Amino acid sequence: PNITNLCPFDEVFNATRFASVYAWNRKRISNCVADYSVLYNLAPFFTFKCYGVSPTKLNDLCFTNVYADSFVIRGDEVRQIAPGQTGNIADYNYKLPDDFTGCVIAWNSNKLDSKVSGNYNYLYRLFRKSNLKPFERDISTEIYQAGNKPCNGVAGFNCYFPLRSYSFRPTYGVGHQPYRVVVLSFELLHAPATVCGPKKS
């Protein structure tokens, strides 16, 4: 307990640009010493829930391997990131398994993510044949043929574009604003530890 090392949570939580929900840029971190006090003490966190472990005794744990995945979402579906929850975003873009052990962090970011012209860098897919296996990316833009009619090339009726975009401008109310969502996924002490917080005395 010196402590010696550090890990760039200011790289993720203060990143100027986030990928949308279709190609969320998961980042795996190892050989770190991360302090959550700089995180939790931040003011505008309006949603901080955790499932596998209590948000109080985080600083006295060791993690086998941590994946931090960040993106943006609409507020209305923020409750959908919960494990086992269904709907639209938690069914066709990115969903969490029931055995999930990490935890999530969501807050309101209208300072920079809000766009007066709307969301035309982010989007969220609506059409897909099968429910994706948890924590699996999907980047293919294969045109989803809705009816029985096959179709390639351009859009139409029974032939729809598989992608739809949000619109996060300040006139949108609470729940319609850009809510950043980060998720930390880790396995709780089943392997030699490479990342542990400051072991306090």
Partner: antibody, heavy 118, light 111 residues
Amino acid sequence: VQLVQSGAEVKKPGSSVKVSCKASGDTFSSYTFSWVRQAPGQGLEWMGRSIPIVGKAIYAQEFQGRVTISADRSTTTVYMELSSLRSDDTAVYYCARDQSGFDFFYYDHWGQGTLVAV
Amino acid sequence: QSVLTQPPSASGTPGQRVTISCSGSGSNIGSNTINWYQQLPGTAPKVLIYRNNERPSGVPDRFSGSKSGTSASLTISGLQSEDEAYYHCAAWDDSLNGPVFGGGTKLTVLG
């Protein structure tokens, strides 16, 4: 940025216009694209906006339907089609690139368009 | 033609501090910032200023923009003889969910 478009051509009333704008030196898809015309030596007024990411487009409510806007991400290009031209459409057309979709800064990167006389 | 009204012409002599004002309605200009644009004669128009207070890279600095509710005013000091051009004001009209541009001014730099 590096913006280019089609050359200037002259038409007659009752015709149709196919005009194109290309952007290079950046990621074409990520930025939305706006189309605005201006009569020679006259005021400015906005026509429409187009979304390379999706293809959804918005037009001026006073000019719905009579004009159409298309975009392509594989060839990375945007097009107007104009219908029912008249002397009121004698103007220069500009394809602008949004640098940021925020009130702090917007609608800066922007090209020299194409003049059209009817 | 737009909500943002604008006098048609403006004049300026060398070494003279000149002011140009653009006004609209509280629906759009009283709740959103204003951008100013320069239609230089004959060829591609160029940007002047965004958000009334900060300027892009490479643009000169004698332009001074300010906003007071309905009225946005640009002040020019040390005006040069090559600046005779159209000047326009623009704002993201929220009622129509689109950009709206001013009538424009003919800035004439008398010799």
